[PDB]
Point group: C2
């Protein structure tokens, strides 16, 4: 199966051209990609979706060396190594990828994101889906385990129904930090709607 | 303040007018308050905008807004494309009206099997913009309006939805349905044993 490669961080004509010349294609999104090529660990839709799916996240050297070979090389030795952001964000990329490959982080979760949330709900929905969760199109009316509402102060006036039925009201960082680290921990991210 | 999505042509003047008049540029149709375009097209951007019922307007909206000095009401600037309204058999104004009443896929739950074209994540964006739920994996149980969009490559994986009576549908159920704002699964049922 020919790689569908996504680029992010660097506008890299030589790399893109090498993908095509080697018989691969360029990916339109991280959700479609087989491989992500990048320089650093970043909290972006592209990086978080790639990580949530557990696809290879590789340096530009993969294509540099593949171009010399004349064919796509095995990905293993080209994994992104960013000790600085690993320290600063408190996770190991290899370990996070290993977790994602065993089971996607949000399997079993149903998540509604209220309209005023930042980052924008549709971007949050893309990340939720790439982590195997269900992005809900409207506010729930009933309780279910692992059904949660990502919300914000602007939207507290609209939260009486989820409060009524005991659905957790969570910070958007539940998703962003959780997906980055591949660890879901709703409790520290519970909002205070009356304050 | 409007968040305006452009699609079709790079319209630098139009983009500046948006910024000057107190708006911003939208990153996607799912985020936009307004879509500016020349023609009716079957694209993720156009279909998402239509599913959401947002104004879909010509380049003249911003041209006249810039001349007037403020964002004009959208009503007079709706895209008029009689040719594509023919290629596709629908009225854009009527479709927008339908979308504003109720989103097309309210109550639907849709799984798209991995081999489908256009790609599942794009189908998922459209499903969500039409008020449906895009499912992350194959269902195991029957529910009304729970359907599976699939394809010949994926027929070998369809025993469970067949077992429980979930419809197996063509991707055009979505694409044609959203374009027209009419959801009619029957014509789109696939034949998995052939």
């Amino acid at each position: 199966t020919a790689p569908k490669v996504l680029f992010t961080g660097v506008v890299d004509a030589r790399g893109e051209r090498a993908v095509l010349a080697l018989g691969g294609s360029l990916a339109g999104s991280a959700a479609e990609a087989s491989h992500l090529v990048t320089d650093r660990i970043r909290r972006t839709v592209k990086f978080l979706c790639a990580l949530g799916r557990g696809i290879p996240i590789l340096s530009l050297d993969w294509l540099h060396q593949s171009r010399k070979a004349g064919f796509f090389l095995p990905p293993d030795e080209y994994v992104v190594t960013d000790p600085e952001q690993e320290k600063n964000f408190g996770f190991s990329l290899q370990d996070a990828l290993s977790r994602a490959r065993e089971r996607r982080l949000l399997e079993g979760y149903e998540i509604y994101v209220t309209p005023g949330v930042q980052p924008p709900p549709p971007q949050m929905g893309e990340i939720i889906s790439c982590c195997g969760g269900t992005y809900l199109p409207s506010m729930p009316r009933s309780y279910k385990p692992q059904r949660v509402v990502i919300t914000c102060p602007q939207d507290f006036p609209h939260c009486s129904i989820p409060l009524r039925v005991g659905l957790p009201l969570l910070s958007p960082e539940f998703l962003l930090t959780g997906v980055l680290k591949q660890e879901a921990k709703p409790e520290a991210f519970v909002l205070s709607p009356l304050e």
